[PDB]
Amino acid sequence: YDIQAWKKQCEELLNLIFQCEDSEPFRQPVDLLEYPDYRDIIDTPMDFATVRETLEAGNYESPMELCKDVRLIFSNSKAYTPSKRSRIYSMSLRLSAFFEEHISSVLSDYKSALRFHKR
Ligand SMILES: COCCNC(=O)N1CCN(C(=O)c2cccs2)C[C@H]1C
């Protein structure tokens, strides 16, 4: 019932993600010179460094907010990829499954802790 536990859990999960080779394309903001049409397609850029920074700044209130930004990384990748058979797309899908598998208990524990708090 620890309401704050999510934060270290998410720090640990981001560490795992940074160790995953599949995260390499998603670790830094897209270079807008290198992909000059990016912002024509993507309204809200997001990357794992930004997520980690936001977390470490104390600018997430909940794991749900972190989970929304991480999912945006994957939706951005999926939207910019020209093919479902692309390398980056395939990496997105794998990393997303890994993330979703690990974030599920973080979310459940948090929501459970909050419910207990308001019981
Ligand atoms: C020669 O192969 C290069 C392959 N790389 C790419 O196509 N990209 C990098 C990933 N991406 C994204 O949307 C995001 C990067 C950060 C977070 S989401 C798509 C695109 C810019």
Numbering used by the authors: 1316 to 1434
Task: Provide the authors' own sentences about this structure as they appear in the paper.
A striking feature of the diving products is that they all have a methyl‐substituted piperazine ring. When looking at their closest lateral neighbours based on chemical similarity distance, it seems that this alkyl substitution is required to change binding orientation. A significant change in protein conformation is revealed by this novel diving binding pose: the ZA‐loop adopts a more relaxed conformation, resulting in a more voluminous binding site that accommodates the flipped products, thus illustrating that some level of conformational motion is present in our crystal system. The aromatic 5‐membered rings seem to bind mostly via hydrophobic interactions within the water cavity. In addition, the cis‐orientation of the two carbonyl oxygens was observed in the diving products whereas the lateral products displayed a trans‐orientation. The synthesis of the three diving products made use of racemic building blocks, resulting in CRMs containing a mixture of enantiomers, and the quality control protocol identified that products with the expected mass were present in the mixture. Individually, none of the diving products could be unambiguously assigned to either (R)‐ or (S)‐ enantiomer: all relevant variations in electron density were no higher than the standard deviation observed in the immediate vicinity of the protein model. In contrast, taken together, the electron densities for the three repeat observations offered consistent support for the (R)‐ enantiomer, revealed by a paired sample T‐test at the 1% level. Overall, these results indicate that the protein binding site defined by this crystal system is favourable for the methyl group oriented in an “up” (R)‐fashion and located on the same side as the compound′s cis‐oriented carbonyl oxygens.
